[PDB]
Amino acid sequence: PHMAIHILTEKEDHATLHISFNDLIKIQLRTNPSTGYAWNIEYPTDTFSLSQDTIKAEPHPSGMVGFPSIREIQLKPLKVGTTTIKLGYSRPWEKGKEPLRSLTYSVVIR
Ligand SMILES: [Cl-]
């Protein structure tokens, strides 16, 4: 046993992550707020607490400001068990339609 922070990105789509009860999951995704797109996260509310949610300019601003930005969400397990996290990249004015891109992660909290 020990605390670990597990970093998930776009590249880990469909991965299954095994974590301990005192771990953190840190999802780090690029985004371009000036296009109106944003990531939306869904998970069971009785399963994780949001320990931090952040949008920030890249630490090496080579290109234009805010392009891209980094969206980071850090989740802490509330309960042990198995759960799924879904992300969608879309504009706000969507009538529940399909997002431009989707990500899915499976999490086993042991
Ligand atoms: Cl975002």
Short mmCIF file of C-alpha atoms and ligand atoms in Angstrom, two decimals:
data_model
loop_
_atom_site.label_atom_id
_atom_site.label_comp_id
_atom_site.label_asym_id
_atom_site.label_seq_id
_atom_site.Cartn_x
_atom_site.Cartn_y
_atom_site.Cartn_z
CA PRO A 1 0.00 0.00 0.00
CA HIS A 2 1.06 3.58 -0.81
CA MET A 3 -0.49 6.63 -2.44
CA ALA A 4 -0.20 6.89 -6.21
CA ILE A 5 -1.32 9.46 -8.77
CA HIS A 6 -2.30 7.94 -12.10
CA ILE A 7 -2.14 10.17 -15.16
CA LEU A 8 -4.59 9.50 -17.98
CA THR A 9 -4.53 11.27 -21.36
CA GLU A 10 -6.23 10.98 -24.75
CA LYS A 11 -3.86 8.12 -25.57
CA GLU A 12 -5.26 5.91 -22.80
CA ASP A 13 -8.78 5.79 -24.27
CA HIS A 14 -10.49 2.49 -23.36
CA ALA A 15 -7.78 1.58 -20.85
CA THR A 16 -8.55 -0.19 -17.58
CA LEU A 17 -6.85 1.32 -14.55
CA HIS A 18 -6.32 -0.52 -11.26
CA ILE A 19 -5.95 1.85 -8.33
CA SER A 20 -5.93 1.75 -4.55
CA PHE A 21 -8.44 3.43 -2.27
CA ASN A 22 -6.07 6.30 -1.44
CA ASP A 23 -4.89 6.99 -4.99
CA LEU A 24 -5.72 9.96 -7.24
CA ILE A 25 -6.67 9.87 -10.89
CA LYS A 26 -5.42 12.82 -12.88
CA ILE A 27 -6.95 13.19 -16.35
CA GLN A 28 -4.97 15.66 -18.48
CA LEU A 29 -6.37 16.63 -21.89
CA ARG A 30 -5.68 19.38 -24.44
CA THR A 31 -8.52 21.71 -25.28
CA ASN A 32 -9.15 24.88 -27.29
CA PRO A 33 -11.67 27.04 -25.37
CA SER A 34 -11.60 29.72 -28.09
CA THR A 35 -13.38 27.29 -30.44
CA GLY A 36 -16.19 26.84 -27.92
CA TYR A 37 -15.33 23.17 -27.34
CA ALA A 38 -14.90 21.76 -23.85
CA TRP A 39 -14.49 18.40 -22.22
CA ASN A 40 -17.40 17.13 -20.16
CA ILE A 41 -16.91 14.41 -17.59
CA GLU A 42 -19.44 11.86 -16.35
CA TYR A 43 -18.97 9.32 -13.58
CA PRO A 44 -21.11 8.01 -10.72
CA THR A 45 -21.37 10.73 -8.05
CA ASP A 46 -21.17 8.24 -5.18
CA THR A 47 -17.81 7.01 -6.49
CA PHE A 48 -15.35 9.89 -6.85
CA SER A 49 -14.87 13.31 -5.31
CA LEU A 50 -13.50 16.12 -7.49
CA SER A 51 -10.31 17.11 -5.75
CA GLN A 52 -9.31 19.62 -8.45
CA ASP A 53 -10.59 20.80 -11.83
CA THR A 54 -8.41 23.20 -13.81
CA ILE A 55 -7.92 24.79 -17.18
CA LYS A 56 -4.49 26.29 -17.79
CA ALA A 57 -2.30 27.72 -20.54
CA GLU A 58 0.50 25.35 -21.62
CA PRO A 59 3.78 25.65 -19.63
CA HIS A 60 5.64 26.18 -22.92
CA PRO A 61 3.44 28.78 -24.72
CA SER A 62 5.05 28.33 -28.14
CA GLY A 63 1.85 28.86 -30.10
CA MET A 64 -0.99 31.31 -29.54
CA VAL A 65 -2.37 31.98 -26.05
CA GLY A 66 -4.99 29.43 -25.00
CA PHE A 67 -4.13 27.26 -27.99
CA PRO A 68 -3.98 24.73 -26.78
CA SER A 69 -4.92 24.88 -23.14
CA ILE A 70 -4.67 21.96 -20.72
CA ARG A 71 -7.76 20.66 -18.92
CA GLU A 72 -6.91 18.67 -15.79
CA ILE A 73 -9.37 16.85 -13.59
CA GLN A 74 -8.21 15.07 -10.43
CA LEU A 75 -10.54 12.51 -8.89
CA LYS A 76 -10.25 10.80 -5.53
CA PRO A 77 -12.13 7.53 -4.90
CA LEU A 78 -15.00 7.72 -2.43
CA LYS A 79 -15.70 3.97 -2.37
CA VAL A 80 -14.01 0.76 -3.47
CA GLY A 81 -15.50 -1.11 -6.44
CA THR A 82 -15.59 -0.89 -10.23
CA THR A 83 -16.61 2.18 -12.17
CA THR A 84 -16.43 3.92 -15.55
CA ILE A 85 -15.49 7.48 -16.48
CA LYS A 86 -16.72 9.00 -19.75
CA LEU A 87 -15.51 12.23 -21.35
CA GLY A 88 -16.96 14.09 -24.31
CA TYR A 89 -15.46 16.99 -26.24
CA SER A 90 -18.26 19.21 -27.53
CA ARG A 91 -19.74 22.68 -27.75
CA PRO A 92 -22.32 23.75 -25.15
CA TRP A 93 -25.30 24.15 -27.51
CA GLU A 94 -25.67 20.41 -28.10
CA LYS A 95 -29.07 18.71 -27.86
CA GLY A 96 -27.54 15.61 -26.30
CA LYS A 97 -26.06 14.76 -29.70
CA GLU A 98 -22.80 12.81 -30.06
CA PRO A 99 -19.64 14.62 -28.99
CA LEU A 100 -16.88 15.39 -31.51
CA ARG A 101 -14.56 13.02 -29.61
CA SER A 102 -15.29 10.68 -26.71
CA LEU A 103 -13.01 9.01 -24.15
CA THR A 104 -13.85 6.12 -21.85
CA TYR A 105 -11.84 4.76 -18.91
CA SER A 106 -12.57 1.75 -16.73
CA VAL A 107 -11.43 1.98 -13.14
CA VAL A 108 -11.09 -0.80 -10.61
CA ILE A 109 -10.68 0.54 -7.08
CA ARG A 110 -9.26 -2.22 -4.92
CL CL B 1 -12.09 21.82 -21.48
#
